[PDB]
Design a binder for these strands. Structure first.
Lengths: 72, 71
DNA sequence: AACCCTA
DNA sequence: ACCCT
């Protein structure tokens, strides 16, 4: 199949700070490049939820960008 | 460098990822090269932890996506 | 350490 | 489909 998906990641606050970036410049790149709908749960909480939604090519791009950021 | 990623998955999807007798997750652990843990019990949302080099985590994640897209 | 977002 | 650190 080629159905749209919704993938949710449970992330530590520190990691989320890196994904968002100063002024949200990192997640802006992820949204503009991946084609995924990306939602990051509200508040600088110890644990946060990142939602990725779209077809597999978009999910793969966003997930790749997230793990690449975290590897930094 | 090694990362740990946690996916939040509904029980229905976890059943598919595990597979009958754990056959599916077994295959994922063997060829992905990642450590894969699926949370115990029956919470509406389960946690699938993927651990190892980013390449192994990505491979495991790809196998999961493939499973969700089956048939 | 970063706080964004078809609100 | 319920695996197994």
């Amino acid at each position: 199949k080629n159905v749209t998906l919704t993938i949710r990641l449970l992330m530590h606050g520190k990691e989320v700070g890196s994904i968002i970036g100063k002024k949200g410049e990192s997640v802006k790149k992820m949204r503009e490049e991946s084609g995924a709908r990306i939602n990051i749960s509200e508040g600088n909480c110890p644990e946060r939820i990142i939602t990725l939604a779209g077809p597999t090519n978009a999910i793969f791009k966003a997930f790749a960008m997230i793990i690449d950021k975290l590897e930094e």
